[PDB]
């Protein structure tokens, strides 16, 4: 059905159209923000047409558009897969993007370079979708590196600020450590089984496939902020709030989760790596969640929640439940996008206050965002019959029913209670409290560009879990049979998580000094992984270059040995041979010596 193929190729052409308009002189004459917002809107509708096809018939398509090099045995070609993962994600991503660009127009209003900002956002979407629908992994690499570079360009939008520059260099470094893993997996699949195309890599099921998948797991940990190198996604919040929503919140981070689902036919074979990520996903879930409890920056708390939810997503991939992991990716995108832009509304409406400490009683001052915030908060806490509930409790009870690390099982559940706690922290401090913001009040959220997108995503946050769960193809053969406390565990832990936190928030109001526990600061400064591993490594990696590798072995030792020594050896030799009295007697005698030696040279060799 060409309608299907053409549609998958068409979304890319339509989104690329804003990019070249800015290359020509035409954008000055038309409005770039409005034009870009409309075309993503049309791209979402175009994406819907294949989505219905798949659902009606559940069929996939590998599209080989252009050949790039034969390179002898390994031919390289540009291929877009249209498997359930690719088209489901393509639709969810553009809806979020359509929401954010309209938010972007309101948020960055008064920025002198709005058009460039919108331009990079769509370039990000083009790389993100290429990363999504990539058959051969070389294209997956183009997407993997591609979102990394544009994140660097967009985290540090305001280049002047060194803090933004530091975060951008952070993000590239963590991504590049991840890139080493993908290169290793690529190289292993460029040798052994031989083609970077997924359709053939999957014929490596009954092989070792550990050297390679360990590489992809390493790539995922860097891209998805698992416990190892978890800090750049918190650091990424130095970016503009809309950038934080579409890339820090949904498309960029889920890329690591998406890669492993693409390669899970191979993942099911190796038991060792499955528990490895189950284990690290589990550690990141709580580690990030505990850090979020004391963080006093609204954007920071949401970002930690982005990492904690993906930690749960990592856990399901680790328990070899790929389809549900993808289901959470889609539902995760709707609500996290909402909460960020919700805080975008609060931060912009207030005098750019990004701290929960000075922000209060937004519920009465701004009901529209507060309503959106609590809708999102409950979805994050898996309120029954909301989008989180359809996918999240499936994952929870999956854990409660599988054979798993006891430590992983316990931490994931309390991680769920903490998600309720920090969710409670945000609404109590941000919304339900006496106002503490600066005295002059100038709040307006009436702008259509704020409401509309927030309104549209809110509709998605309310109904998406209903629609996606029923429509997707039956998969995974879930276990609905459980003792009732395990069946209802997700619901109860979420309930008491808020209950306990509400007790905490309530406690503070008293005139009695509590401050915080000794491990509280440990929590507030991010587990101290940032304070220690960011000051030692960059210090003992640069000291060795300047002091040891550059100046010691370079410069002096490699210049005194080869280039300089040969300089000296000769210099000294000329000094002895050319220091001559000039007297004839001396010189002549030397002629005598010569005659003698030559007489002998003949004599002995007679």
């Amino acid at each position: 059905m060409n309608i299907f193929t053409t549609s998958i190729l068409l979304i890319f052409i339509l989104l690329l159209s804003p990019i070249l308009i800015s290359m020509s002189n035409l954008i000055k004459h038309i409005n770039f923000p409005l034009y870009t917002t409309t075309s993503i809107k049309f791209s979402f509708i175009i994406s819907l047409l294949p989505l219905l096809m798949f659902f009606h018939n559940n069929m996939e398509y590998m599209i080989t558009t252009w050949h790039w090099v034969t390179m002898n045995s390994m031919e390289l070609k540009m291929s877009f897969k249209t498997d359930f993962f690719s088209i489901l994600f393509t639709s969810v991503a553009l809806f979020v993007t359509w929401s954010i660009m309209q938010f972007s127009s309101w948020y960055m209003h008064s920025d002198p370079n709005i058009n460039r900002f919108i331009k990079y956002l769509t370039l990000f979407l083009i790389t993100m979708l290429i990363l999504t629908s990539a058959n051969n992994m070389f294209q997956l690499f183009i997407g993997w590196e591609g979102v990394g570079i544009m994140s660097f360009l967009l985290i540090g939008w305001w280049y002047g600020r060194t803090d933004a520059n530091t975060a951008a260099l952070q993000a590239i470094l963590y991504n590049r450590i991840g890139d080493i893993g993908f290169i290793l997996a690529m190289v292993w699949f460029s040798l052994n089984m031989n083609s970077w195309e997924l359709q053939q890599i999957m014929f490596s099921n009954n092989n070792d496939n550990l050297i390679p998948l360990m590489g992809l797991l390493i790539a995922a940990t860097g891209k998805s902020a698992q416990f190892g190198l978890h800090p750049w996604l918190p650091s990424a919040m130095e970016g503009p709030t809309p950038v934080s929503a579409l890339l820090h919140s949904s498309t960029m981070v889920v890329a690591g989760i998406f890669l492993l689902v693409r390669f899970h036919p191979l993942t099911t074979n190796n038991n060792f790596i499955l528990t490895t990520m189950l284990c690290l996903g589990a550690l990141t879930t709580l580690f990030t969640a505990i850090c979020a409890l004391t963080q006093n920056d609204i954007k920071k708390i949401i970002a930690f929640s982005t990492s904690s939810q993906l930690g749960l997503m990592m856990v399901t991939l680790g328990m070899n439940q790929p389809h549900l992991a993808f289901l959470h990716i889609c539902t995760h995108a709707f609500f996290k996008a909402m909460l960020f832009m919700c805080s975008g509304s609060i931060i912009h409406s207030l005098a750019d206050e990004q701290d929960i400490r000075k922000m209060g009683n937004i519920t009465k001052i701004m009901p529209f965002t507060s309503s959106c915030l609590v809708i999102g908060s409950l979805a994050l806490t898996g309120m029954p019959f909301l989008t989180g509930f359809y996918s999240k409790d499936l994952i929870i009870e999956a854990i409660n029913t599988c054979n798993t690390n006891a430590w992983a099982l316990l931490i994931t559940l309390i991680a769920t209670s903490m998600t309720a706690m920090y969710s409670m922290r945000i609404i109590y401090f941000v919304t339900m409290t006496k106002p503490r913001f600066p005295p002059l009040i100038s709040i307006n959220e009436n702008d259509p560009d704020l409401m509309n997108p927030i309104k549209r995503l809110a509709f998605g946050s309310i109904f998406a879990g209903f629609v996606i769960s029923y429509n997707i193809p039956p998969t995974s053969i879930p276990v609905l049979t459980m003792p009732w406390f395990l069946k209802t565990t997700a619901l109860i832990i979420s309930v008491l998580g808020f209950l306990i936190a509400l007790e905490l928030n309530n406690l503070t109001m008293k005139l009695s000094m509590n401050k915080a526990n000794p491990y509280s600061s440990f929590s507030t400064l991010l587990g101290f992984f940032p304070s220690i591993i960011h000051r030692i490594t960059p210090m003992k990696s640069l000291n060795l270059s300047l002091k040891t590798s550059l100046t010691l072995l370079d410069l002096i030792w490699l210049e005194k040995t080869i280039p300089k020594s040969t300089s000296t050896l000769h210099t000294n030799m000329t000094t002895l041979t050319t220091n001559q009295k000039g007297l004839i007697k001396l010189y002549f005698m030397s002629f005598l010596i010569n005659i003698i030696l030559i007489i002998i040279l003949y004599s002995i060799n007679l």
Binding site: S110, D111, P112, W158, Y159, G160, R161, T162, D163, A164, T294, Q295, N296, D297, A351, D352, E353, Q354, D355, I356, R357, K358, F429, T433, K434, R436, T508, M509, K510, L511, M513, K515, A516, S521, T524, L525
Partner: protein, 178 residues
């Protein structure tokens, strides 16, 4: 940022600058307001007492144990304002603060528009060159006898003279270029 740094700090400015860090690091612990305003007038009490200690030695022994009490009772994420060093918007808008000596290489076409703008800019540049002599001379004639020298610069002290080394405190790129 405007005034110049004093060489050594007095006892007072060290005490009175703790009253700021302290009270401001007490409003991170006391997220609410009534709790804060309470727990803080209790802070002043601490500083209010031991105000009239005349025994310097003692005073510098209350100060040195105050700033250690504080270091161990500080909040890791203090509430630092949005636009101040260490903040969230610090130097955000600096990507738009071009340094104003760049409008001098504009093409005669660009400067063709925006006409009255450059008519006033050429006046100010006449002001700058018209006083560099009287300024530097002032800066020098008033070089106090060689000795302690601080970064403080003199005012005008005569009509028509422009308070010196002024071209970059005035003509500063605007804070929010937006």
């Amino acid at each position: 940022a405007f005034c110049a740094p004093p060489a050594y700090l007095t006892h007072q400015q060290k005490v009175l600058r703790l009253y700021k860090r302290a009270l401001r690091h007490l409003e991170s612990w006391c997220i609410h307001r009534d709790k804060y305003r309470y727990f803080a007038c209790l802070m002043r009490a601490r500083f209010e007492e031991h105000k009239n200690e005349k025994d310097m030695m003692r005073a510098t022994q209350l100060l040195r144990e105050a700033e250690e009490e504080f270091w161990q009772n500080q909040h890791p994420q203090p509430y630092i304002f949005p636009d101040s060093p260490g903040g969230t918007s610090f130097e955000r808008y600096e990507c738009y603060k071009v340094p104003e000596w760049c409008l001098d290489y504009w093409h005669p076409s660009e400067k063709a528009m925006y006409p009255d703008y450059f008519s006033k800019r050429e006046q100010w540049k006449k002001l700058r060159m018209e006083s560099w002599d009287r300024e530097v001379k002032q800066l020098q004639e008033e070089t106090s006898p060689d000795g302690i020298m601080t970064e403080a610069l003199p005012p005008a002290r005569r009509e028509g003279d422009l308070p010196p080394l002024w071209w970059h405190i005035v003509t500063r790129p605007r804070e929010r270029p937006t």
